[PDB]
Amino acid sequence: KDCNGSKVMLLGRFKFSDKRFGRVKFSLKTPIADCNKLVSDFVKQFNPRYINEE
RNA sequence: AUUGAAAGUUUUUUUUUUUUUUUUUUUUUUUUUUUUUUUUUUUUUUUU
């Protein structure tokens, strides 16, 4: 939902059989494009199933 | 049936010889097998 900050994502070799391995987050370094309106449109059109990452 | 007649114009002789339809005469002169086409798309080096 937030353009200026992402959630935590599982990625790497071990991300299920471990707690301290496979926790990464994304961020925009050049937010030069309007993004919040785009995210709002996407969630208002498709209504994606929000999920949480252990 | 004569004045009154009975006789092959016949035998014999090669139209033959000499002489290459011959010499010269390149089926060649030219014409680009080119021309448009991305070896491309899909796939988390990974779990009890």
Nucleotide nearest to A22 (CA to C1'): B44
Tokens found for residue A29? 């370094």
Amino acid at position A15, single letter: K
Measured from the CB, is A12 under 7 Å from any atom of strand B? yes
Q: CA A49, C1' B4: Å apart? A: 175
Experimental approach:
cryo-EM
A12, closest nucleotide (Cα–C1'): B44
* Breaks in chain A after residues (C–N exceeding 2.5 Å): none
Say whether A41 sits in a helix, a strand or coil: helix
> Resolution limit in angstroms?
3.5
A14 CB inside 7 Å of strand B: yes
Alpha helix (H) ranges present in A1-54? 36-45
In DSSP terms, which residues pair with A9 in a beta bridge? A24
